[PDB]
Amino acid sequence: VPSQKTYQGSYGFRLGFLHSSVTCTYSPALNKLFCQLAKTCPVQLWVDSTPPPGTRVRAMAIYKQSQHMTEVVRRCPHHERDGLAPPQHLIRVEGNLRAEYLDDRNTFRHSVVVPYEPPEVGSDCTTIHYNYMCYSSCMGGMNRSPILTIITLEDSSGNLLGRDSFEVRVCACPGRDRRTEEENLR
Ligand SMILES: [Zn+2]
C-alpha cells in the first residue's frame, strides 16, 4: 500500500492549495480538500530547487483507514459510465497534453502522471488541475471511509523524489461540508 507520509526530499517538495458557489475549497485544519464532481481542482507544486529534467508528478488515491488500505480506489459502477482517462479512474488531469493514465500490474491501483514543469513566466509555483470523477458517498460505504490523494514527485524511472498528500471529499456542497466538518472538529 502506498505510503501517505510527507517526504519533502532533496528538492523541498510540498503542495499548496487554492480556493476555487464553491467548487473547490481546502481546509488547512483538516488537511482536506472539498470539491465538486468533475470540477477544476487547482493543486500547486512548490519546490525549493528545480528537479532534474524528466521529473514526473503522479497522483493516486487510497483509503485513509488502515483496515481498508488494501482496497483499490475506483469509480462506482454508475460513474464509470475525454477519450483519455479510463472510465474506472477516479482522478483525471485537466488541461495537460501529456497525462498518462496508469494501472499498476501488481496492485491494480490507478494513477495519473504528468511531466513536472517549472513555474511558467509570471508564477512562483507549478499548478496542476485535477478532476475527481466519483463522489465520496459512492466510494465510502456505510461509515463514510475517507480517501487520501497522494502526490509524488518522481524521476524518469519512477524513483521517489518527494511526496505530499491530503484527504479529499468529493461532494455536492464543498463549502457547506467543510464548515460542518470543521465545526465538528470543535
Ligand atoms: Zn460514483
From Swiss-Prot:
Changing residue 128 to S: In sporadic cancers; somatic mutation; does not induce SNAI1 degradation. Changing residue 91 to N: In sporadic cancers; somatic mutation. Residues 169-176 are annotated as: Interaction with DNA. Changing residue 1 to I: In familial cancer not matching LFS; germline mutation and in a sporadic cancer; somatic mutation. Changing residue 41 to R: In sporadic cancers; somatic mutation. Changing residue 155 to P: In a sporadic cancer; somatic mutation; requires 2 nucleotide substitutions. Changing residue 152 to I: In a brain tumor with no family history; germline mutation and in sporadic cancers; somatic mutation. Changing residue 66 to G: In a sporadic cancer; somatic mutation. Changing residue 32 to E: In LFS; germline mutation and in sporadic cancers; somatic mutation. Changing residue 118 to Q: In sporadic cancers; somatic mutation. Changing residue 140 to D: In LFS; germline mutation and in sporadic cancers; somatic mutation. Residues 4-186 are annotated as: Required for interaction with ZNF385A. Changing residue 113 to I: In a sporadic cancer; somatic mutation. Changing residue 178 to P: In sporadic cancers; somatic mutation. Changing residue 28 to R: In sporadic cancers; somatic mutation. Changing residue 96 to K: In a sporadic cancer; somatic mutation. Changing residue 92 to P: In LFS; germline mutation and in sporadic cancers; somatic mutation. Changing residue 62 to F: In sporadic cancers; somatic mutation. Changing residue 100 to A: In sporadic cancers; somatic mutation. Changing residue 176 to S: In sporadic cancers; somatic mutation. Changing residue 21 to F: In sporadic cancers; somatic mutation. Changing residue 172 to V: In sporadic cancers; somatic mutation. This is Cellular tumor antigen p53. The gene is TP53. The chain holds residues 97 to 290 of 393 of the full protein.
